[PDB]
Structures are given as structure tokens and as C-alpha cells.
Write a protein that binds this DNA or RNA. Structure first.
Ligand code: MG
Length: 579
DNA sequence: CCTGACTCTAA
DNA sequence: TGAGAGTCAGGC
């Protein structure tokens, strides 16, 4: 039973200039969510404060907002945002244990203080799940149990700062935490708090039109099946397709017959039901995920969505977005793309501005591999897909057919995402053998990329990990494995992580640089979203001309590589038009 | 109610 | 390739 004071007023000794601070928000989505308790651990002792006491106290609030009063926390964005919703600024967070643990080993899955603490053999803190329960049973416990938990977390943070900072420094990652991930966390908190405005009326009428289309196609499907069934059930659809209608089984899943879109495309010539099922799937995906899904998470009082960015989840250093996920809004097919008409500026006479890197991953690869051919291509700002086709097929530019370019683009995509030869075969509907031939032909044209791929797998084997441009790390113990599939995956991750992770590093740096530049230039423009290689802002219409120059330049100059970086940009009345 | 399987969307 | 989400179905 750890010693602490259950204070019922704030005292001067709670406001020391260095502390471990816990501002506890138990709800998974922390927007406008309750703070259930506060703990402070510092040189003078350990303290628990009730939030209705602490957050109405002027000296405590001034302390929270004083940048010169340093705090160590876990998941400081959660606390910062919950506080933003109460009109209180949190400053001076000089160490975030969540981001520290994430940098030290993203594969650990650290999502509470106890998981971080276990990495340094500190176990005097319970997992959050043990205290709050899980799922339906999730609940805030009685004050004594809650208070001891928060104080134990704060005490762990206080104890663990030094050993985490020492390891970060041995890894050359201390500047990564302090100059990149922590400042980024503040920027993301502002982006989430600002939110993106949604034209719910547009979304609703789209939903009405979709529902009408769904009803028509659903009926057509039952007619063609001679029967009603749940079209959304791959199992029931499987019985209709493969048993009642006797279509060939081209592919199986673990548990049954495949009904994936690519399989269905190949069955379309056998039966009219198939094209109708494909149409149903496309419409139903839009309706259920995009329209019903978005509408459910728009806040009714401001008509905004406030995503939460997970900065401490992916193995590559990429951001993730939830509730809603705004990184997978349709764009490829026009029907789906219209969804983006519903994302609008939050003020009148404002516009949406979007800026994206052009081929950042292959440009990073050019730089890291020093491949002379690939570097020359980007120095000439060539269409990289056409140029790759010309090299692999050994033809002139005017002999590149559309299919040749599509296949080259597929090879390039494979390189950017670290897909296997099986994956490539699958993506191009060709044999594994032919895919191996493509890949081999690629390495003959880009021998420096071949050399990089060989060298980085050996490096991963020797060191145990690979690193990105800004010193992010991914451990790959699977690389040795005697299981071929397990090992091959590890090798692909060794190849791909420095590409994808360096691209992540760059855009994170761009974000930091951009936020600083916007303030220096006294613009009202604000950052709303990041979608891997693009940044989405809204600004007064009078700022567009300046942003057209400023944003690409900041992004382009974020790092200096052996090849240029190139940023394209667009703006308009909705995210759709920012194209 | 919880969890795994299947499908689909983006980069 | 990574992630997030919706839906179903089996086990509870
Ligand atoms: Mg792009």
C-alpha cells in the first residue's frame, strides 16, 4: 500500500518545477471526456487530487500551463486534449513514457504504464485492465483503489524516466523523442481538437440514394438466386454461388470458399448474379462504413469529427487514425470519392488545402540505395512507372503500352510496401515464376536497389534490427528463423522499414516545420489531417496564394536527400475538390 | 457479450 | 505490406 497524501486542497509543494503527472481519462475516446483523478509525484512526496478540486484551483491550472514547470507523463496527448476541452492548457511536458517505450521497441505493444515499466523489471504498478476491468465490465473503482493506482503510475513514471532516457541515448534516439515525437504530439493534439467539419446533410442524402440503389440490386440478387439470403454473409453467399449455382471454386479460405472481389470478377462470365453481388458489395461498403460510419461519430453540436491519431502503434513509425479513420476515405473510384465532398472548411470563406509528396518512398529508396539509375530518374522528374517499364521491358518511351506501365507500377508498389513475389503474382494475376522474372529484371536495371536489399537483410541479421533516417528502429528476431515464411516476412520488413519509416520520419519533421512557419508568417491556416504522405489544412480563402508557395517549400525542404523531394498541391471548397 | 474470420478501403 | 472498421457466426 504505497504512501501518498489524499489531498482535499492544492498546496505549494505540489507545484514543484519537476514532477510526474497523471491526468487520468479512462474513456477510450478522450474527446470531451471526464478526468477521473490526478496524481502528482515530485521531490516532496506523492499526491492524489480530485479533479473538481485541482482543475478549479488557479495556482494548479497556472502550474499546468507553465512551460518552465516540467512534467513527465504517459500519453500526454490524451491528457492535453481532455484538458483542451475544459479550456485548460497543458505545457512543459518534457518526457512522455509512452513515446519513449514506443521508440525503444514498437513491437512490444506498450499501451499502459505497467507494460512500459515491465521493460525495465519494474512491476510495482498494475495494468490498467486489472483496475478498470474490460469491455462491458469496465468501470472506475472506488476512490481508494483509484487513488492508489494513479499514484503508482506516477511513481513508476518518476522512477522510469532516467533509465528510459539513458537507453534512448545509447540508441541515438534521444533527439528523436525530444525534437520530433514529443513536439509532434502537441501538433496532433491541436489537429484532433480542431476537428474536421462535415456536411451531414450531404452525407444523409447520399445515404438515401445509396439505400434506394441497394434495395434495387438486393432484389435483383434474390431473383437471380431464386431465393432470399443474407448477401452480407460470405457463408450463405458461398452456398448460393458454389452449391446452388455450381460456379467453379477458384479459391478457398481457411474456413470455406472465397468470395473476395477478385475471385468474383473471374466468375462474372458464368452467371449474371456475380456482377450484381459486386455492385452490392461496393454500394454496401460505402453505406455501412463511409456514410453510416461517419455519421455515427460526427459530434452533433459542432458537426465535426475529431479523430484520434495513434502515434505509438505502427512498426514503421506511421501514424494511425481512429473514430473515424480518416486515412482510408475513398478516392480511387468516383462513386466512392464523392464521400469527400462532405468534408468542408469549418468557417465561411475558408477553403481546404492539400499537399502531397510525389513518390516519397521511391525517392527515399533512391537516396538510401544510391542507385544511379533511380537517382537519375528522380533528378529528371520522370514518370517513375513509365521509366521502370522502359527499363524492365527494354523499350523506348513511345513503345510503353498501358499494360506495361500497369505491371511496372505493380512492381514499384511491391517495393514500396514490401510485398512478396507471391503477393506480386497475386496482384498481377500471373504465376509466381513470372513474378520472380519481373523482380529479377527489375534488379538488373536497378543494381543499387538489389545491393541495398541484400545489404540491409545482412545488417538486420548482424545487428538484430534496422533503422530509419532519423534513427527509428525495428527489431527483427524472426530473420534467422528456420520457417521459410516467417523468415521471408522478416527479410521483407528489413527491406521495407527503412523506406516506409524514413518517409514517416520526413513527413513528421515537415509537420513540425510547418506549424512553426505558419506561426512565424502569422497565418490563420491550420493543420487538420495527415494521411501518410499528405497534409490537409483549412485556411481563409485570402491565404491560398501564400500557402501554395509556403506549404510545398516547407515539405520539400524538411530533409535534404540525394534526390529532390517534390510536393504537389491543390485547394478547393471541399476535400473532394482539393484535387 | 466476446472474439475470430472474411472482406474492403487507403497509403 | 502494413490499420481500422463493419458484419456474421460460433461459443458463451
Ligand atoms: Mg502522392
Amino acid at each position: 500500500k504505497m504512501a501518498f497524501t489524499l489531498a482535499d486542497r492544492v498546496t505549494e509543494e505540489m507545484l514543484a518545477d519537476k514532477a510526474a503527472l497523471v491526468v487520468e481519462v479512462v474513456e477510450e475516446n478522450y474527446h470531451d471526456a471526464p478526468i477521473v483523478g490526478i496524481a502528482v509525484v515530485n521531490e516532496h512526496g506523492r499526491f492524489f487530487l480530485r479533479p473538481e478540486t485541482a482543475l478549479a484551483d488557479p495556482q494548479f491550472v497556472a502550474w499546468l500551463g507553465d512551460e518552465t514547470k516540467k512534467k513527465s507523463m504517459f500519453d500526454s496527448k490524451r491528457a492535453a486534449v481532455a484538458l483542451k476541452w475544459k479550456g485548460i492548457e497543458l505545457c512543459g511536458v518534457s518526457f512522455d513514457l509512452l513515446l519513449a517505450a514506443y521508440l525503444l521497441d514498437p513491437a512490444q505493444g506498450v499501451d499502459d504504464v505497467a507494460a512500459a515499466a515491465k521493460m525495465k523489471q519494474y512491476e510495482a504498478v498494475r495494468p490498467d485492465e486489472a483496475v478498470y476491468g474490460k469491455g462491458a465490465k469496465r468501470a472506475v473503482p472506488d476512490e481508494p483503489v483509484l487513488a492508489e493506482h494513479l499514484v503508482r503510475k506516477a511513481a513508476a513514471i518518476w522512477a522510469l524516466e532516467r533509465p528510459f532516457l539513458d537507453e534512448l541515448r545509447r540508441n541515438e534516439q534521444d533527439r528523436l523523442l525530444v525534437e520530433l515525437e514529443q513536439p509532434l504530439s502537441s501538433i496532433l493534439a491541436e489537429m484532433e481538437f480542431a476537428g474536421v467539419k462535415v456536411d451531414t446533410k450531404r452525407l444523409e442524402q447520399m445515404g438515401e440514394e445509396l439505400a434506394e440503389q441497394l434495395r434495387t440490386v438486393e432484389q435483383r440478387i434474390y431473383e437471380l438466386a431464386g431465393q432470399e439470403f443474407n448477401i452480407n454473409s460470405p457463408k450463405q453467399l458461398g452456398v448460393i454461388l458454389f452449391e446452388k449455382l455450381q460456379l467453379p471454386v477458384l479459391k478457398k479460405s481457411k474456413t470455406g470458399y472465397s468470395t473476395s472481389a477478385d475471385v468474383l470478377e473471374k466468375l462474372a462470365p458464368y452467371h449474371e448474379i456475380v456482377e450484381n453481388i459486386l455492385h452490392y458489395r461496393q454500394l454496401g461498403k460505402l453505406q455501412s462504413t463511409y456514410i453510416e460510419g461517419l455519421l455515427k461519430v460526427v459530434r452533433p453540436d459542432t458537426k465535426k469529427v475529431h479523430t484520434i491519431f495513434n502515434q505509438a502503434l505502427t512498426q514503421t513509425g506511421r501514424l494511425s487514425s481512429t473514430e473515424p479513420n480518416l486515412q482510408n476515405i475513398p478516392i480511387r473510384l468516383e462513386e466512392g470519392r464523392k464521400i469527400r465532398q462532405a468534408f468542408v472548411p469549418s468557417e465561411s470563406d475558408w477553403l481546404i488545402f492539400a499537399a502531397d509528396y510525389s513518390q516519397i518512398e521511391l525517392r527515399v529508396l533512391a537516396h538510401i540505395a544510391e542507385d544511379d539509375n533511380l537517382m537519375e530518374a528522380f533528378r529528371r522528374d520522370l514518370d517513375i512507372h513509365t521509366k521502370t517499364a522502359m527499363d524492365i521491358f527494354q523499350v523506348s518511351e513511345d513503345e510503353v503500352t498501358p499494360n506495361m506501365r500497369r505491371q511496372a507500377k505493380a512492381v514499384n508498389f511491391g517495393i514500396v510496401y514490401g510485398i512478396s513475389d507471391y503477393g506480386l503474382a497475386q496482384n498481377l494475376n500471373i504465376s509466381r515464376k513470372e513474378a520472380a522474372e519481373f523482380i529479377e529484371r527489375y534488379f538488373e536495371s536497378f543494381p543499387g536497389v538489389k545491393r541495398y536489399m541484400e545489404n540491409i537483410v545482412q545488417e538486420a541479421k548482424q545487428k538484430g534490427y534496422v533503422t530509419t533516417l532519423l534513427h527509428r528502429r525495428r527489431y527483427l528476431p524472426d530473420i534467422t528463423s528456420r520457417n521459410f515464411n516467417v523468415r521471408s516476412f522478416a527479410e521483407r520488413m528489413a527491406m521495407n522499414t527503412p523506406i516506409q519509416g524514413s518517409a514517416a520520419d520526413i513527413i513528421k519533421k515537415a509537420m513540425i516545420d510547418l506549424n512553426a512557419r505558419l506561426k512565424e508568417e502569422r497565418l490563420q491556416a491550420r493543420l487538420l489531417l495527415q494521411v501518410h504522405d499528405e497534409l490537409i489544412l483549412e485556411a481563409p480563402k485570402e491565404e491560398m496564394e501564400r500557402l501554395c508557395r509556403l506549404v510545398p517549400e516547407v515539405m520539400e525542404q524538411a530533409v535534404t536527400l540525394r534526390v529532390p523531394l517534390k510536393v504537389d498541391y491543390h485547394y478547393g471548397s471541399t476535400w473532394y475538390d482539393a484535387k
